[PDB]
Nucleic acid binder design. Structure first.
Ligand SMILES: [Mg+2]
Ligand SMILES: [Mg+2]
Ligand SMILES: [Mg+2]
Ligand SMILES: [Mg+2]
Ligand SMILES: [Mg+2]
Ligand SMILES: [Mg+2]
Ligand SMILES: [Mg+2]
Ligand SMILES: [Mg+2]
Ligand SMILES: [Mg+2]
Ligand SMILES: [Mg+2]
Lengths: 176, 141, 70, 136, 38, 94
RNA sequence: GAUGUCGGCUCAUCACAUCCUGGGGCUGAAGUAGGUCCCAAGGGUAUGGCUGUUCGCCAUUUAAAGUGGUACGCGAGCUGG
RNA sequence: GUGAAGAGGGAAACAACCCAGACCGCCAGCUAAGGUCCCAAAGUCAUGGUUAAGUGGGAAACGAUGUGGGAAGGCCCAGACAGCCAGGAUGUUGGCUUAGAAGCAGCCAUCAUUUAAAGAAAGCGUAAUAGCUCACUGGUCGAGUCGGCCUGCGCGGAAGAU
């Protein structure tokens, strides 16, 4: 039509497996599974994978799109190693890591330590930068925000941990 | 579109330079050496028409050193001299402050030629006519 | 999305309300609740409900009649 | 304030109040705005609508009006029952589904008609025009 | 502000106005400006 | 030229007609000349798109009824009060 | 062949269209304080002067002194202005 | 027309509404209105289609890329719709104005070149320039894509006191 999804290679490391519905993948990165919906019928010839809609039911066809993509990311994650980094701006704001507990000195009375789930560590190349990186893109996303969420940037200044991309310059001029 | 430090442009008088407001801080921020350029610019500007505002593009290097190309004076300015007028019309096209012969425009087109893209003289002449019509300067053939 | 609604008795407009996904303390209750009302309503159908035996955990304490079954 | 009606002589009086039946169709401009469904088109309603057409647009061409109120609508204060039949003062047109807008110079025909359709109590389609061809 | 009924959407860059019925004119991609469901 | 297919009517009255247009088949007529008036049942959602033109009420038309010919023109046109829909159509024979 | 009026006292019970406190969105939101809208009924939600008053105005408090239903809640419970 | 002066069955309950006029008795049949999963008598009936909100099982203006159907149109395998890559130039910082106004405070003008394309410029931004994004175009990918017309069912609008 103008959209769909058909490709999903299985290079080295890509040790995909299906158990009726379940799909466990392996590789240089980690062990990620993701039992899709029920109708789902994914397989694997030698390289291309393919979702399986029990039939052309409304909530059954589109269920393919969201699927042929999720697994694909599982592959793109396991082979590349996912990264995403945010930056902290504002006086006093600092950064630090000690394995998991990424101590955070933002601007409250006492600093904190966000313990990241397993599969994604983080590194502060400086007291200003934090670069998280792991396999599963899921835990990646939530923790990406779960972190910046500790202090969302405010317009008047911009201060507050922001994704290292956020267009938000600053405010609309103040007033009263 | 896009606007970054390094390779600055400015239109400075023929034989005059160094004032802070006009020059100084402008390129001074970039790391240019005010004095050297002042004397350097006005040196060649002697040969180039004195009394004629001439735009120059200075390009600085990591060295903080720099070079600059002196081109031909602005079309608007040239049209002013040609017209014998000091200023534009304020409300161009509504009120004409001056006039210039078609011959003159060819002469200005010829002067600016180096800086203009014009494939042929007619093209050049007309790029300048465009400026004249923006200046409230009529052209009589 | 579906409550059951009981209302105790001691007013104070307490009026208890619990959803289904909220049925984690005693799943046995439901079903027995549903199967009710569909009875003659009164004495006969009242002492007729117990012939169900709740049980929420498959083959467990089948002692309710461990001896014979079908 | 406007008043499409009033402006009649004083006699003849007022009374009655019936129901309705079918509509009607006119033709005077390049674009018309017809309504669909009985309702009460009071003088105030009609002025509000029409007056809202120019609404800082343009005085271009000229708008019309096929609709025209016939007052005879009595109301009573905080008083007893059927002690008379208090004055009226209110308005009412009593349309069905007639055409009543019409536009002179094209310009923004359909556009404006919509920019001022809510003032009316009834629902009116975009309608089209005096015709012997169509649209789309 | 976040309205109750529906005030259309206006502007251009406003949200696709798609979701669980969220109108509110504003035009997102206005770092500060953000008139919407609330 | 415009070509409108059609056929004679079964009946002709309240119930009858009302039942045709209720299925995209507004009943029309065709008179003029020595030939007895013709009562047909054209296809609504197929003629309203053809009347869409200004040519429709100028140049003669060809109604394919039964399988014969006629070559006529449009006279009166009965359209719905508020629905873009169309109704009874008068046809002036040649 | 009788369903006792207003206000007060006593003692209440519910609604939510929320006054305070709790959580949010926008702001012509720097902060502090506000404006408005969403959510929210757990709990809390003034003493007096004048008047029969309800209410109201006034003095002084308070986080605040909510709107409303309950025969304009409440006389086989009090009062009788 | 019914009740009054009418019983029986139906609308949960319900003089008037729907069915229907009770001479008695019957552990015998067929029907009306209305119904057939349990309370509760009888299809968990069949052939097809809609809905996904418990709509059915309360309520308007108006609002919305919900989802069903029918007809007509706009661009497009000389390549469209979304995206990715690349460019977006010259006179010129247009004239005036202004401390400055260089596409982007404001007023006027808004031409012309070079072109595959390139507004004297759509927003952000600078003290003003620098810089960022936009209109437009080339390459990529290769089939639909973008709205209205008429209609089905549905959603929001939707706050109350034991
Ligand atoms: Mg019973
Ligand atoms: Mg509320
Ligand atoms: Mg008091
Ligand atoms: Mg009372
Ligand atoms: Mg007593
Ligand atoms: Mg007394
Ligand atoms: Mg009697
Ligand atoms: Mg039978
Ligand atoms: Mg049964
Ligand atoms: Mg319901």
């Amino acid at each position: 039509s103008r959209v769909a999804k058909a490709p999903v290679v299985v290079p080295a490391g890509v040790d995909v497996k299906i158990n009726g519905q379940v799909i466990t993948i392996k590789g240089k990165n980690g062990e990620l599974t993701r039992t899709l919906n029920d109708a789902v019928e994914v397989k694997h010839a030698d390289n291309t994978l393919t979702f399986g809609p029990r039939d052309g039911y409304a909530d059954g066809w589109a269920q393919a799109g969201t699927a042929r993509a999720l697994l694909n990311s599982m592959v793109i994650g396991v082979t590349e190693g996912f990264t995403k980094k945010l930056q902290l701006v504002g006086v006093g704001y600092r950064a630090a890591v000690k394995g998991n507990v990424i101590n955070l000195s933002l601007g409250f009375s006492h600093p904190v330590d966000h313990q990241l789930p397993a599969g994604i560590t983080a590194e502060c190349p400086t007291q200003t930068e934090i670069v998280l990186k792991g396999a599963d893109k899921q835990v990646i996303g939530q923790v990406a925000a779960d972190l910046r969420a500790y202090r969302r940037p405010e317009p008047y200044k911009g201060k507050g941990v922001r994704y290292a991309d956020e267009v938000v310059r600053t405010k609309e001029a103040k007033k009263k | 579109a896009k606007k970054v430090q390094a390779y600055v442009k400015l239109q400075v008088a023929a034989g005059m330079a160094n004032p802070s407001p006009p020059v100084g801080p402008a390129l001074g921020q970039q790391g240019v050496n005010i004095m050297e350029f002042c004397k350097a610019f006005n040196a060649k500007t002697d040969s180039i028409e004195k009394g004629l505002p001439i735009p120059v593009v200075i390009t600085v290097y990591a060295d903080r050193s720099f070079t600059f190309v002196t081109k031909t004076p602005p079309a608007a300015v040239l049209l002013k001299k040609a017209a014998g007028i000091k200023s534009g019309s304020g409300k161009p096209n509504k009120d004409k402050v001056g006039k210039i012969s078609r011959a003159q425009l060819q002469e200005i087109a010829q002067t600016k030629a180096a800086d203009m893209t014009g494939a042929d003289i007619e093209a050049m002449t007309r790029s300048i006519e465009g400026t004249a019509r923006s200046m409230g300067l009529v052209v009589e053939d | 999305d579906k409550v059951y609604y009981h209302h105790t008795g001691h007013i104070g407009g307490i009026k208890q309300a619990t959803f289904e996904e909220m049925i984690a303390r005693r799943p046995e209750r439901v079903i027995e609740i549903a199967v009710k009302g569909m009875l003659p309503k009164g004495p006969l159908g009242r002492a007729m409900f117990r012939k169900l035996k709740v049980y929420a955990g498959n083959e467990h304490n089948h002692a309710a009649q461990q001896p014979q079954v079908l | 304030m406007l008043q499409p009606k009033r402006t009649k002589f004083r006699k003849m009086h007022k009374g009655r109040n019936r129901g309705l039946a079918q509509g009607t169709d006119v033709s005077f401009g390049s674009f018309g705005l017809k309504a669909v469904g009985r309702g009460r088109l009071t003088a105030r309603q009609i002025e509000a609508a029409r007056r809202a057409m120019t609404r800082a647009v343009k005085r271009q061409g000229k708008i019309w009006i096929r609709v025209f109120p016939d007052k005879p609508i009595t109301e009573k204060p905080l008083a007893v029952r059927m002690g008379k039949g208090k004055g009226n003062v209110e308005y009412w047109v009593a349309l069905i589904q007639p055409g009543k807008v019409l536009y002179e110079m094209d310009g923004v025909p359909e556009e404006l008609a919509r920019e001022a359709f809510k003032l009316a109590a009834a629902k009116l389609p975009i309608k089209t025009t005096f015709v012997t061809k169509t649209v789309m | 502000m976040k309205v109750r009924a529906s005030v259309k959407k206006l502007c251009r860059n406003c949200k696709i106005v798609k979701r669980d019925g969220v109108i509110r004119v504003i035009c997102s991609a206005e770092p500060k400006h953000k008139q919407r469901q609330g | 030229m415009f070509t409108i297919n059609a056929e004679v009517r079964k009946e002709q009255g309240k119930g009858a007609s009302r039942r045709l247009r209720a299925a995209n088949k507004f009943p029309a007529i065709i008179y003029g000349g020595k030939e007895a008036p013709l009562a047909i049942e054209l296809d609504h959602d197929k003629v309203m798109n053809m009347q869409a033109k200004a040519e429709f009420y100028s140049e003669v038309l060809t109604i394919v009824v039964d399988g014969k010919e006629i070559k006529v023109k449009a006279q009166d046109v009965q359209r719905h009060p508020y629905k873009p829909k169309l109704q009874h159509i008068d046809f002036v024979r040649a």
